[PDB]
Write a protein that binds this DNA or RNA. Sequence first.
DNA 1: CAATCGTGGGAGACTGGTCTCCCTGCAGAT
DNA 2: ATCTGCAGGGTCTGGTCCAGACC
DNA 3: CACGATTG
Lengths: 163, 163
Amino acid sequence: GWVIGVDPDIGGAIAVLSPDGSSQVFDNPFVHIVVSEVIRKRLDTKSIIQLLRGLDAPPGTTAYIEKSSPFPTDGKQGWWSTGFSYGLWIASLVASGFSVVPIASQTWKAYFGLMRSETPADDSRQAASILFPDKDQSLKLKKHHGRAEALLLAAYGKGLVLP
Amino acid sequence: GWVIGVDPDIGGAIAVLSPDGSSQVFDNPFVHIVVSEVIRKRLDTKSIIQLLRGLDAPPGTTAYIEKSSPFPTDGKQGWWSTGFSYGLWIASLVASGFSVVPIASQTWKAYFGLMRSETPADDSRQAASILFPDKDQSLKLKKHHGRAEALLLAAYGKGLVLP
DNA sequence: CAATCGTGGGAGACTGGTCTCCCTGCAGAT
DNA sequence: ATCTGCAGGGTCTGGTCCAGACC
DNA sequence: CACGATTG
Ligand SMILES: [Mn+2]
Ligand SMILES: [Mn+2]
Ligand SMILES: [Mn+2]
Ligand SMILES: [Mn+2]
């Protein structure tokens, strides 16, 4: 009963669920780098691999990762970034011994009843708070939706249900 | 002593230069996958990590990889792929214990005097044929320019010079 | 299979149709 | 530090920005 | 560079 969930974007997170029901969630490590004479956030490859190497989850644990699906109206830098983040995470997960299962955002949203909300990020945090009450304090900021998404991905993969 | 050169695109390659002067070059592994009801080529994450595991190059060996730099006129799918291929390779290389150094294409081209050619692919293969004569049969086809690019990147890292 | 060409493009889940979904990169306000 | 709003965008290297190059 | 063709 080990499951990993990964929201791969720059404000994303990785959640780890263990057989005893406990949970962990880590913000995606990033660094500030210079691109075309401005500052950009990019995921921190070496920190991600060290994080994955430090997990207690055994080899073969399944990691559910949100499928990249940039909108056609998103700009070309958005497409590059979502592609880059996805490839960095997939390779790090495979290299660390995990079985990687891409999941569409539509799949886990429909599973928890979060399709077509007016406030989708607030709702994600509320749903994750109910599934993981001991994470309640770690979900109270609006910027914490990435943590919520990672936890709901993992919850999906484990088959948890809302009460 | 040991140097790795990576041309990360879908027709790219990885070259490995041993201290005894011998060289190897491998085509980037890929699979065919379905995206939006059409077939696409995508780099094969599992094969890439197995290839890196099988190399004799010791940990800490430097891997030179061409920096991603898509043109603004390239479409958003081009930006996504070059982003994805770059992230996949960088994470694979770090996870396998290699030290990663991104090199702009302008840098290794100017170093071998290949700037501003009317036939840049052909010239790359000729330059790599001269630097690595035992790879001459592996460079006869025009689609082998990715092999040439990987070898030239590695040659740049090693400080080799054309005669 | 290997080469060449022209243009720059969503993708996904539930016999095609339909409808839903992610961001990045800046800026400014507090 | 945190939130919100709007539009969708190159980046790099050699030599105080410019110029010219590249996938 | 990708992508989706077409040409021997
Ligand atoms: Mn997400
Ligand atoms: Mn997210
Ligand atoms: Mn290249
Ligand atoms: Mn290439």
